[PDB]
């Protein structure tokens, strides 16, 4: 603090108290500004440890609502909150190095970083790795070039951009034209919730809004959901995966199951369906707008770090961890969320438990003699008899467009609820509101929802 | 030109609100602009006896008075736009908006060309309602185009945030001492009228109210200069206020620079000639991080092009000269309004509103008349042959916002003056009055929702957003 560095402007610290220049509270490095890192930032003791954060993102992103912003069901301001307003809350003194990680130096015990606003290392006693993971193309060529991921706010802007501009170009031709019709097609690759949600929200849009001001388009508007697996939402059970789907078909969504994208050309994509009666067919879906909401694959730094640790030499999906959520082959390092290969699903839920646990599990390290200095790694935490991480699952949701939603709850293996009608939609909202972090976000979310109830959505390509 | 396909102006849309006779019935009215002038007009006009085409680069309508509250996001930049369309979905007959911009006007050939910045490219008109606006004015002072931020459109907004937002960034990374850091933090608004004042105002409110809350250090060193050629601010009020205005501004740690001209605007600093009552040309260099230019409204090429292609508009300065029926002095079938019509009236919103609502009323009358069943001898003859009342102006009010949480206003109509004064008292009004005067349910709530939200929280000052 007060000095010159190699990270971007948003670099801040809070002066909440003051440090002893020559200091000893162990210093913890959080990687990321998302579901793990931020939740860990919530439950960590900011007094016993001082804490630095590295992510090139200075806000936090409430991903579950993400796909609903691109049609301006929600503004992108509503669903995000800047780290700071978290670290201001926090007790002791916290630092956001406003930049991205670049290499983990486990042996050299620092994390090397560069900013796209800048050979900088950074000190860490302990490392919390929560950078999460990017999406996977599966080298299906063209996706990168013509595709649209749906992972960060930019993408929400990027897609609205692309969609509208078609809608516009599309209007200036005749109904009889087919190019028009192609520009009005919309492929959403990936039939998990996000993609579904996306699809559905683009429907909720054509329908509820657009059709009013322009129905000649709205009629010709095509939305396709496309999924390798035999059903959408394979995380939900088969009963609802049928309803949800049938309902999407009711909303008018073309739902290509057991389909893979083989390649993405500019104006259409090559797709192969694999059939019940054994045979692979092919299709060709033409599109204006291609949202690629599928799968994941860990970042380079995470993977980079697989080499520089010996145990980590075969870590396929992400860093591998013990049941104290610690890197198998490090000690001072922990991986949570999506950069954390732990045989578990890679969701918000998972990551949130992962962080909470590890905060206590951390805080609860604060009264032990060995831990003041410095072999095998997990033997220390087995000894004092900490509890190892036990994932309490608690269901999964999905918006379906046109005001309905499947949903499921559980706690342990007791199913509280598992329905899927207007009732369930009207919960799903409440529910998500509940599971927000910040207030501002919540209320802003709430007002969007309200405003939409009494008026249209905001689909400006300007903004 | 009209059937289906074209190139320029992507937004062009039509509202099929009845069914179109091809060999068509009604006189075609051509409206230029999406602003006050042009949308006040739309709200009232009868689209049954008239077909209506709107030419504007801007598909929304901009709620000007609340503009300056957006860079800091007291309002969100969206909360004060409205796509044109949402008005034509209120109008009865057929309305048609092209997403293009009027380039030249061709009176006697009766066409107003368009070149969208996305594409004989001409348009026909029985009647023309010219409400394109004026642009801000540099007065040739130098670089303002280069280093300055106008405050005229939504973009102008985004820009000024980014700018000042980023300055905030770079400056954090400085040792307190460094002066430049201190400079990055200087903010110069040029202009004293309610815009400049409001800007200056809203900026500070952030700094005071919002910034310090988490970067207290920096707030301290931020400076907001308000430069002005004239004696006192907000000239258009009684002295009591336009002083108090000044007073209260300076309360809020604002460094006001009266009787001051800008001569030149360097990159980091702007060269200012201060001239005193006693007659002494002093000078001062003022350094700035962000430069806002809330002054002047000179008129657009289209408008000034059209002075040539007419005789009566040649040595007209402020815009198109207009008879009392708001037809151009010189041409018949062409009517000017709001800012781009030389009116002898304030170049303000309020004027433009009535200016176009009265043309609306008037247009309703003419529909009955027979002599406007030709035209599909002089300009104003049929307006006097049918005893048309001229336009006249009912100066309903004046208003401005200033202090951390304070304001003043005047609501007097027609020589009887109603309320006037300052304080939080009058703060709570400005709000109530400005919503009231908002031309959209949506807009009004969005804004409302902003203010509500804004109470329990900071404003959002996200730079890429
Ligand atoms: C649109 C969408 C909707 C979803 N909805 C749901 C839902 O309804 N329910 C559910 O259970 N799950 C949902 N998920 C899944 C869930 O959001 C993710 O699995 C979860 O975000 C993982 O959190 P995380 O902390 O691992 O990473 P994230 O929360 O994604 O955050 C990663 C952080 O690291 C930063 N970062 C990235 N790389 C680096 C680097 N090299 N150095 C420093 N920082 C870096 C990122 O900007 C970010 O700050 C959704 C995902 C998406 C995309
Ligand atoms: C920040 C701010 C606050 C203000 N507050 C107040 C206030 O409180 N009270 C008040 O009385 N006045 C106020 N004004 C002044 C007021 O906004 C203007 O006088 C008013 O906009 C004039 O309306 P108009 O229709 O003449 O022009 P505008 O409202 O500018 O309309 C011009 C329209 O034409 C479009 N256009 C431009 N060029 C072309 C072209 N070549 N072809 C087609 N279309 C074109 C523009 O996008 C716009 O839609 C304020 C101005 C600003 C900048
Ligand atoms: C408040 C009530 C729950 C607290 C959060 C628990 C973790 C959590 C958080 C979410 O946002 C989820 C979204 C969809 C599905 C499951 C989810 N889980 O488990
Ligand atoms: C009903 C609400 C009143 C409508 C009156 C419109 C006239 C009007 C319009 C404006 O845009 C103004 C901007 C600033 C100050 C006064 C203004 N007035 O009086
Ligand atoms: Mg994270
Ligand atoms: Mg996130
Ligand atoms: Mg992630
Ligand atoms: Mg993670
Ligand atoms: Mg306007
Ligand atoms: Mg106008
Ligand atoms: Mg104007
Ligand atoms: Mg005008």
Numbering used by the authors:
A (entry chain A): 29 to 146, 164 to 419, 425 to 513
B (entry chain B): 28 to 146, 164 to 420, 425 to 513
Q: What's written in the study?
A:
A series of studies has suggested that Ndi1, one of three NDH-2s from Saccharomyces cerevisiae, would be useful in replacement therapy for mitochondrial diseases caused by complex I dysfunction. We reported that the enzymatic reaction of yeast Ndi1 has a ping-pong mechanism, as is the case with NDH-2s from Mycobacterium tuberculosis and Yarrowia lipolytica. In this reaction mechanism, two substrates—NADH and ubiquinone—bind to the enzyme sequentially, but not at the same time.
There are no significant differences between the structures of the complexes, as indicated by root-mean-square deviations of 0.58–0.76 Å, which were calculated for 454–462 superimposed Cα positions.
